[PDB]
Symmetry: D2
Subunit: 237 residues, 4 copies
């Protein structure tokens, strides 16, 4: 099994699995059934930005999603990641379409991991930032239908020349280098991530959503995880 911690930008409400009756953002801890969600006003065609922050001091994961001139959705969950994650992990973005479809384009992405110790002045860290992706983005592990290059953007799910988004698609893109998310001697551990997304659909309701996840190094897309499972979890439990 895989250990998954993630913030989901869910566009399609699957009321049957406890989804709110509207698009939303939520914190997923080892399950597709969000521990805490927040109403989100999905804007079709408009480029949204999403900022996620976390630190072991207050032990609280938070996510803010905003569109220029428009409001912002926020959500926070009290979680001690050191109990719910391997010491080493791999960070990345996931997205998927199902019966309904949408474009899950990632215009940019940046991440910052920071491990401060008890020993004065000793600190380990990692940070990367992409403002444009290359066809051969040699530092991202592409998985599924994820492809880089087109217009310098990262397409997490299948699209066509018409610009049309294909249904039943699923893709993931995660940074090559393993992230050292925590440790015992660390007095303060905290990570921060930011990405800009572009989502638009031709049909009545877009689906299914983009998500930022943290997982163990060898994580591979679970069998039949398109649609409601956002390409992250193997079952809707």
């Amino acid at each position: 099994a895989d250990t998954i911690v993630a913030v989901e930008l869910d566009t399609y409400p699957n009321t049957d699995i406890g989804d709110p009756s509207y698009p939303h953002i939520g914190i997923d801890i080892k399950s597709v059934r969000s521990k805490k969600t927040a109403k989100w006003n999905m804007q079709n065609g408009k480029v949204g930005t999403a900022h996620i922050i976390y630190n072991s001091v207050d032990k609280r994961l938070s996510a803010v999603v905003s569109y220029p001139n428009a409001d912002s959705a926020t959500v926070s969950y009290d979680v001690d990641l050191d109990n719910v994650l391997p010491e080493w992990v791999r960070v990345g973005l996931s997205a998927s379409t199902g019966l309904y479809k949408e474009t899950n384009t990632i215009l940019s992405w940046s991440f910052t991991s920071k491990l401060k110790s008890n020993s004065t002045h000793e600190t380990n860290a990692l940070h990367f930032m992409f403002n444009q992706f290359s066809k051969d983005q040699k530092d991202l592990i592409l998985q599924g239908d994820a492809t880089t290059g087109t217009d310098g953007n990262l397409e997490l799910t299948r699209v066509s020349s018409n610009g049309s988004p294909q249904g039943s698609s699923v893709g993931r893109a995660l940074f090559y280098a393993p992230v050292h998310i925590w440790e015992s001697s660390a007095v303060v551990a905290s990570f921060e991530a930011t990405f800009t997304f572009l989502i638009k659909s031709p049909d009545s309701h877009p689906a299914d959503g983009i998500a930022f996840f943290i997982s163990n190094i060898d994580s591979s897309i679970p069998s039949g995880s398109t649609g409601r499972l956002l390409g992250l979890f193997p079952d809707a439990n």
Copy 2:
């Protein structure tokens, strides 16, 4: 007097005003009667470190103090600075003594403050990092008995030529340029400071402590803010 928000490293328990019967950590908002406290196994003679963090997402101010190969004190508090501070401020370090003394020596200090806008790539930030203080540190506003140069350190309170601390002393150090702590359009607003220190004393009980405060641009040690008032508040009311 004016507005002050601070995290205090209180080494001497002043019961009459609210100090618990032990050296502690605490969040101070517009008053010297802490909103939150946490025991702190003060290590006399040792070099300690402190980390202060805040962000408008979850909206909590928290601090952590540690010593190499030892425990770590922690304290957080819910506070929306938007309702407690002027949009523009100055940040600094304070210290003091009275009947009993101690050395409030700061070995290094750093600070970072960012303002993430609602519009993509609109981020305003400021960050300085003092790892070595000089005889004429032109970018700091030294107040009270604060001096620079001694071993490249920053002495907040008076120290005798041989090194011995001196009672009834009050000093301060404010970075020169004003900091734009918050803004109404900012989607995310945060800051974080860090400093290593040395609190050494001869007598049975060191006093009074060290503190990181944030106040309005124009600010100086309030009349009579010696000892238990840490040089931050004009009174204990």
Copy 3:
């Protein structure tokens, strides 16, 4: 008088004082008479980016001005800045108009000074970055006609409500906190600034220029510096 070092984005050619027969970029080591220049193909109305860098290992000052969809004009000179500037200085922007005029709008400004001492890795550093300029910017010393808050940009020179520039104008913008540009116990000294400008002129003869400058803490607009002197020098010597 004031000790100045500047990178000049010269739009109007003042052949009479050494200006090449075409708009250009040049390095000024204490005189308006550039120590070296390179042809700059201006792009009236296009937002461009300026990149300036320097380190004490090479003693070479370098600048690069580029536009989207076009080649860039690079320029570099060997100048031991510690043998020209004080240990502490002030960084800022300057712009002026003469008979003919233009808009010297600054969209964003960023700067970073890193002074790495000789001790292990005890580094000192300052970094500010603006991507949005507020109406009352308590951290910027405005001089001359320089205004802010206009579209969240910085207006170095004069402009009328209808976005029409004015002539015989001069304005400067200086960062508040002094900058310790050089130490003598540091193994490596380095700095860099980047700004994005928007120059639009109606009279088919844009004048006069923009310039990044480093000066003495108390620097100020010289008299009659408007026009060909870019509000930086008192004469064309």
Copy 4:
């Protein structure tokens, strides 16, 4: 074979292959016979720090080695890396011993690279810093005798239980994720590296040196590259 561009801290004078009569810092381009060098007052048994720097503006590679309060060696060379290195590479350290020995301890390492493209306000960048090497450092490709964890340091070559160094050893350490060292659209490409070391030989005649190299993704220790070849080049041709 592999394409190597390295900065060598050559402790042993192999006159037979161009090494000066004294220890030195040299710049190696697709060869072990340095293009340029400089005398190095190697201080047997004391922590030192090397600092590499390079940028595309003035296309120059420089290095500075220094021990606390002592001689500061320096060496530079003009080289357009984009015409020598693959658009994608890997970075890492390397050290070795032969008939003579020495401890090749790295106590910390940091790297940072940025790519400012023609695209206004859009950058790409990678930065990592290690102040402590974990027993199981999952983001480094240890080759040869390279081992981390011991004393929280990183041992590039063989070191006996009693601490004594061993002869005829070679080790490497390359960061896991590939580094997009350059790209056409980039108006300004530039990296920076910084690392502290502790070379000590229990006598007076040490050898053979350490080196910071940039190589093609799949570089492996050449056969017989011990000692004078520093585990970087297949032949001292």
